């Protein structure tokens, strides 16, 4: 069974977060409506020395702000974070940074959705500001993609 959890979560009921969609991998604003953990065993404490309960243990149940029709969806803790808020300007970007940026996999020249990405190239020539990144970081990432929206790269918020 699922038990409601009030301590381990980094995000509380009613708080807004960014949540990573389970189908497309992009980040969308959402409201936390419930935080749960798996039920402890009958003869085990909620937290033990062998297995200290951890924030990564919780499941967040969220409702997307712009997709209410999707209903309440369950999120792994790695798929919820504080809303993005700070751009990393062009001059501060570098290879190896992991950022949230805007990319359209189907039409890469055009505006898309917001994905985690690892910068793979960063160079300014007389002709262009070249930014490439491995986009949709995780399984089946899109490697070494040319990024259009080089002035709209966000820092990822971390606890």
Numbering used by the authors: 127 to 285
From the paper:
UHRF1 acts as a macromolecular hub through five known functional domains. UHRF1 is overexpressed in cancers, where it inhibits the expression of many tumor suppressor genes, including BRCA1, P16 and P2120–25. We focused on identifying binders to the UHRF1 tandem Tudor domain (TTD).
Tudor domains are found in 41 human proteins and recognize specific methylated Arg or Lys residues on histones and other proteins. We hypothesized that the UHRF1 TTD H3K9me3 binding pocket might be targeted by small molecules with specificity. The TTD also makes functional intramolecular interactions with the polybasic region (PBR; aa 647–678) and the linker (L2) between TTD and PHD domains that control UHRF1 conformational states, and it can drive high affinity interaction with DNA ligase 1 (LIG1), which joins the lagging strand Okazaki fragments that are generated during DNA replication and prevents the formation of “nicked” DNA and genetic mutations.
